[PDB]
C-alpha cells in the first residue's frame, strides 16, 4: 500500500493521540493558574480539536506557559497532519493524471 496513504493514516492516528494528550496536559498545566478556564477534560478536548484545526474560537485558550507550549504542539500537529493529507491527495492526483496520458 502506497506511502502517501500510509503517512496520511499515521498522521491521523497521531493527531488523535496528540489531541488526547494535549487535552490532558493542558488541564494539568492550566489548573493552579487563577482565572484559567482550560481546566476540565471535556472542554479541553474541544479546545485542542479547535486548536488542531486552527479554528480557535477564543471561548477557551491556555494562559500558562506550559499550556501554551502544549497549544503550539497541538497547532503544529494539526497543521502538519492536515497538510500531509493534502500532500497525499496531490500524489494521488499527480500519479493518476500520468495514467490518463499513458505512463
Amino acid at each position: 500500500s502506497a506511502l502517501h496513504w500510509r503517512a496520511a493514516g499515521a498522521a491521523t492516528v497521531l493527531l488523535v493521540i496528540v489531541l488526547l494528550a494535549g487535552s490532558y496536559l493542558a488541564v494539568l498545566a492550566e489548573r493552579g493558574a487563577p482565572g484559567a478556564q482550560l481546566i476540565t477534560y471535556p472542554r479541553a478536548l474541544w479546545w485542542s480539536v479547535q486548536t488542531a484545526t486552527t479554528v480557535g474560537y477564543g471561548d477557551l485558550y491556555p494562559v500558562t506557559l506550559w499550556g501554551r507550549c502544549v497549544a503550539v504542539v497541538v497547532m503544529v500537529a494539526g497543521i502538519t497532519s492536515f497538510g500531509l493529507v493534502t500532500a497525499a491527495l496531490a500524489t494521488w492526483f499527480v500519479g493518476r493524471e500520468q495514467e490518463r496520458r499513458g505512463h
Partner: antibody
Amino acid sequence: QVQLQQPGAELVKPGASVKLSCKASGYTFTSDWIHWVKQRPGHGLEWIGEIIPSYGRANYNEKIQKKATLTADKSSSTAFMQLSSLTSEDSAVYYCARERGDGYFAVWGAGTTVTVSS
Amino acid sequence: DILLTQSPAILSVSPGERVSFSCRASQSIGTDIHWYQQRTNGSPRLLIKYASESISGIPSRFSGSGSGTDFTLSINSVESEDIANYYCQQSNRWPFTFGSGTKLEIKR
C-alpha cells in the same frame, strides 16, 4: 461501597502537625483529582487544594495561609494532606472528595474531625 | 477569584410548598455551577451538576436552572428530609469556589 475513607478524628497540639489520609476505592481513572475542603464548625465549605494522583501535581488555595501539603501514593490509592504548625484556627472538619476532571465533587469522604488543643 | 453569593441565608417555608435558593456568580460562568446538600453532621452530597443536570439517586423533587451569573436550585414540594444547608460551587475558572450556604428551614 464507601469510596473515600478518612480517619474519624485527629488531636493535635498547637504548633504540631498531623497528616490526614483519604483512601479511595471503586473506579479510579488517570483523570482523577482528589480535593480537600475545610469546614469550620458552623461555617461553610472552604477549598484547600487539589492533587492529581496519576501525575502527582497539586495546587492550593492562594486566598489563605498555606498550611497543607498534598501528596498521593499511587499503589495504595491513598491521598494524603500534611497540615503543619496548626492552631485553634486550624481546628475543623476536613473532607476529601473525588472530582473526575469534570468540575464537580462526585463523592465526599465522611471527613476527619481535627481538634487542635493541649 | 469568582464569588458565589447565596442570599437569603435562611429560607423558611411550609411543608409541601415549592422553594428556591439563589446563587449569584460575580461573573459569567456559563452553566459550570453545581449544587450540594449537607444535613446536620453529614458530608456534602451532590444534588445537581452543571446547573441543571440531575444526578442519580436524587429525588426527582430537586431541579436546577440558570446560566451566566444567576442560578437557582428548586425543590418542588419540600419535606422534613430536605432540612439542611445548600451550597453552590463553580468550576468555570480556577480555583473552584463555594457559596456561603443557605439553610432550609421548615415551618410546621
